[PDB]
Design a binder for this molecule. Structure first.
Ligand SMILES: Nc1ncnc2c1ncn2[C@@H]1O[C@H](COP(=O)(O)OP(=O)(O)O)[C@@H](O)[C@H]1O
Ligand SMILES: [Zn+2]
Ligand SMILES: [Zn+2]
Ligand SMILES: [Zn+2]
Ligand SMILES: [Zn+2]
Lengths: 350, 9, 107
């Protein structure tokens, strides 16, 4: 199985056979496959290399934008860089340094609390870096943030879904802006607004278009409710979801097969009135058939994680305060990566 | 936990 | 009801609507609203109750990736000048690996 895939990769991009020994397939995702390979350096020792084979249905501008994120933003501040890139026709392979890393699920229950602090700090370093360039990653989640516990090394990876802010410094992301473009009624309004009613007027309206590339369980509420003007705040929400998994011991934390089920789960954690209030500020009316109160984050996480030893026995208030700011339902007030690095949770750190 | 099938452009 | 398209949503539900009223609302109806399950063992979600795609080059849906990639339309795009934007970025990277000559069979 893996053997035929490797043989086919050498056939697809023949230059690889003169440079790399492809040893194994380490990743299989929606838009790429990633292989472990060994190469010799002209001036250094042998190196392990991650070869990312982009799906050949990818548009060339999308391929180039991913590469440009890696070359311009990557290579420092815990953002993966690129060593080289090989192309034959529609087959593009990005060669990156291989970072040996933990499985998030495997280490979730053995991380010390101090290691959770260090992990979050270094995630925010990476997000501060990409957000400075106006990159909205859109798919912040543990499999896109590689962590080597022993070496204390971190790498944000995978710019295959990224979009640009209006401000972006990644030239090619001006061709993939996060601001949606809408498609192409006898009565504009109807009496169903903010009620449980439906009628022929509202049901027959066109559909709103908004970006939503990403992964189920990590999308911010403004994504789930089809806000056409999304910002780097969606990445900070996703970082909040990672933190919520770390503090609760539960991963994946949310488990939903569609956007409004994900929203219903968020309302069950953060409260329905709180979610409704925030959504009004970005132009969305949410109605739920039952009101549910916000959960206290400390009680929730500690009850789901169970008895704490060592650092886990006395998690500081600052941790749940930072979590509350990351999971801010209002994307305008949600904490930024730059601000998060200044939060008291990170007292006495680098 | 893979990405959804669709993305922009 | 369904014939007149007018009525009320069966509960429980979530309904979302853009406040401009320009767009169709979207709805969620499920049998059970989410329940936080603290009994299920970690690391499980407290909400746990348990080759098709689109070619961006051809602007076409496909049901089998490998089949689409072999189609004549996709091959023509793959072999075109549309990747100059990629090659322009590559030409600024520095190649620092050892490159071997091809091995030719002997005798
Ligand atoms: N530079 C790298 N070093 C080590 N492992 C990597 C690297 N890049 C990717 N991976 C592995 O490959 C997986 C897939 O990488 P990613 O860029 O997310 O592609 P995909 O979109 O297919 O998931 C990652 O979760 C990680 O396990
Ligand atoms: Zn990824
Ligand atoms: Zn109506
Ligand atoms: Zn609800
Ligand atoms: Zn195609």
């Amino acid at each position: 199985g893996v053997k035929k895939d490797i043989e086919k990769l050498y056939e697809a991009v023949p230059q690889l056979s003169n440079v790399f020994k492809i040893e194994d397939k380490i990743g299989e995702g929606t838009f790429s496959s990633v292989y472990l390979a060994t190469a010799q350096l002209q001036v250094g020792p042998e190196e392990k290399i991650a070869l990312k084979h982009l799906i050949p249905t990818s548009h060339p501008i999308r391929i180039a934008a991913e590469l440009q994120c890696l070359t311009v933003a990557g290579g420092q501040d815990n953002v993966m860089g690129v060593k080289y890139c090989f192309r034959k026709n529609d087959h593009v392979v990005i060669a990156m340094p291989y970072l040996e890393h933990e499985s998030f699920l495997d280490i979730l229950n053995s991380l010390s609390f101090q290691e959770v602090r260090e992990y979050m700090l270094n995630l925010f370093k990476a997000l501060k870096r990409i957000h400075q360039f106006g990159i909205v990653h859109r798919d912040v989640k543990p499999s896109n943030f590689l962590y080597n516990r022993r070496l204390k090394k971190y790498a944000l990876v995978d710019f295959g879904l990224a979009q640009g802010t209006h401000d972006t410094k990644i030239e090619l992301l001006k061709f993939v802006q996060s601001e949606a473009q809408q498609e192409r009624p006898a009565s504009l309004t109807c009496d169903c607004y903010a009620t449980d009613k439906v009628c022929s007027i509202c049901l027959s309206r066109r559909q709103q278009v908004a970006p939503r590339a990403g992964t189920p369980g990590f999308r911010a509420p403004e994504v789930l409710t089809k806000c056409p003007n999304q910002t780097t705040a969606i990445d900070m929400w996703s970082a909040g979801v990672i933190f919520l998994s770390l503090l609760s011991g539960r991963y994946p934390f949310y488990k939903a097969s569609d956007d409004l089920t994900a929203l219903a789960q968020i309302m069950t954690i953060r409260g329905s009135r709180e979610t409704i209030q925030a959504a009004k500020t970005f132009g969305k009316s949410i109605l739920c058939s039952k009101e549910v109160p916000a959960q206290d984050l400390r009680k929730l996480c500690e009850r789901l994680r169970g008895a704490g030893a060592g650092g886990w026995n006395e998690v500081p208030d600052e941790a749940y305060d930072l979590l509350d700011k990351l999971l801010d339902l209002n994307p305008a007030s949600r904490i930024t990566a730059e601000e998060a690095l200044l939060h008291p949770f990170f007292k006495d750190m680098s | 936990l893979t990405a959804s099938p669709g993305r922009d452009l | 009801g369904p014939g007149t398209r007018t009525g009320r949503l069966k509960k429980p539900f979530v309904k979302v609507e853009d406040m401009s009223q320009l767009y169709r609302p979207f709805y969620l109806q499920l049998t059970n609203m989410p329940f936080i399950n603290y009994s299920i063992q970690k690391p499980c979600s407290p909400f746990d109750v348990d080759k098709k795609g689109y070619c961006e080059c051809c602007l076409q849906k496909y049901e089998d990736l490998e089949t689409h990639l072999l189609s004549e339309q996709h091959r023509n795009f793959a072999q075109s000048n549309q990747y100059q934007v990629v090659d322009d970025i590559v030409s600024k990277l520095v190649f620092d690996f050892v490159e071997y000559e091809k091995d030719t069979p002997k005798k």
